[PDB]
Amino acid sequence: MAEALFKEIDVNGDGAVSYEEVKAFVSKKRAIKNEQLLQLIFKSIDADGNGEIDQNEFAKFYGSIQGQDLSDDKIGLKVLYKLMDVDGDGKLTKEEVTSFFKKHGIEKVAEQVMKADANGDGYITLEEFLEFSL
């Protein structure tokens, strides 16, 4: 229902958008430097540089070429989790993880991991850690 929104914002009803309109749309979400970030995207979008765009451009603008941002961050953790496991299985336990974290003393993590389990076994995996992060 993207086009629905894109059109919605387009109170004008021309079927086309602009840089200010888009900025607003994105703004509706957050304001973490969307003006700049956008300006970058938009610019890259506006091939002709008419200063405006259309639904199509907006559709692709949304981000469907490499929808990534969080996962990328999940990779880091994942790796780490893999680093910890120097056995060669791809799974960790509350006791093991707690033993490794103990070094830090963030027992909390132990509590969070214990609560994360849910199942009630006393073990966890990488896929579970990721899915849980999502």
Curated annotation (Swiss-Prot):
Gene3D superfamilies: EF-hand. Ca(2+) 4 binds at residues 117, 119, 121, 123, 128. Keywords: Actin-binding, Calcium, Cell projection, Cytoplasm, Endocytosis, Metal-binding, Phagocytosis, Repeat. Ca(2+) 1 binds at residues 10, 12, 14, 16, 21. GO terms for molecular function: actin filament binding; actin monomer binding; calcium ion binding. Disruption phenotype: RNAi-mediated knockdown causes a severe reduction in fluid-phase endocytosis and phagocytosis. Also, recruitment of actin to phagocytic cups is impaired. SMART domains: EFh. Ca(2+) 3 binds at residues 85, 87, 89, 91, 96. It comes from the Eukaryota. Ca(2+) 2 binds at residues 46, 48, 50, 52, 57. It is found in: Cytoplasm; Cell projection, Phagocytic cup; Cell projection, Pseudopodium. GO terms for cellular component: cytoplasm; phagocytic cup; pseudopodium. Residues 1-32, 33-68, 72-107, 108-134 form the EF-hand domain. GO terms for biological process: phagocytosis; positive regulation of macropinocytosis; positive regulation of phagocytosis; regulation of actin filament bundle assembly; regulation of protein kinase activity. The keyword Signal does not apply. Calcium-binding protein which probably acts as a calcium sensor and modulator, contributing to cellular Ca(2+)-mediated signaling. Activates endogenous kinase(s) in a Ca(2+)-dependent manner. Plays a role in regulating actin cytoskeleton dynamics. Regulates the association of actin filaments in a bundle but not actin polymerization and/or nucleation processes. Required for host cell phagocytosis and macropinocytosis. Homotrimer (via EF-hands 1 and 2); oligomerization is required for its function. Interacts with G-actin in a Ca(2+)-dependent manner. Interacts with F-actin in a Ca(2+)-dependent manner. The N-terminal domain (EF-hands 1 and 2) is required for localization to the phagocytic cup, G-actin binding and activation of kinases. The C-terminal domain (EF-hands 3 and 4) is required for G-actin binding but is dispensable for localization to the phagocytic cup and activation of kinases. This is Calcium-binding protein 1.
